[PDB]
Amino acid sequence: LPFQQFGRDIVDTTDAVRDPQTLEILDITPCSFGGVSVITPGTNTSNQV
Amino acid sequence: PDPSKPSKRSPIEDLLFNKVTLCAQKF
């Protein structure tokens, strides 16, 4: 709506914004992340992982 | 099991899987 500036999801986290100059609606998504798992055989067998 | 269905599930299992229905974001 013309009077609305930001946006929030169900858990009250910003996920949209209006550009101050061009007045465009831009989506915001966090950059990727995750865990790291290492698969190895017995260390007395080899050193490849 | 019903061979016609691509998932190879019995009709009762199909109804059981369709009955249960499961947010899912904001990592």
State the nearest Cα–Cα gap between A23 and chain B, in angstroms.
Answer: 26
Instruction: Work out the end-to-end distance of chain A between its first and last CA atoms, rounded to an integer number of angstroms.
Output: 54
Partners of A28 on chain B (C-beta within 8 Å) are none
Tokens of A25: 């609606």
3-state class (DSSP) for residue B22: coil
Q: How far is CA A41 from CA A4, A30, A35, A48, in A?
A: 57, 35, 20, 8
Write out the two tokens for A42.
């017995």
Burial of A37 (0-12, 13-18, 19+ CB in 10 A): exposed
Tell me how far apart the alpha carbons of residues B25 and A8 are, in angstroms, rounded to a whole number.
13
A49 CB-side CA count, 13 A: 8
Please indicate whether, in this complex, the C-beta atoms of A10 and B27 are within 8 angstroms of each other. no
Q: Are B10 and B2 in contact (CB under 8 A)?
A: yes
Q: What is the DSSP letter of B11?
A: H
Contacts of B4 (CB under 8 A, 6+ apart): none
**Resolution to one decimal, Å:** 3.0
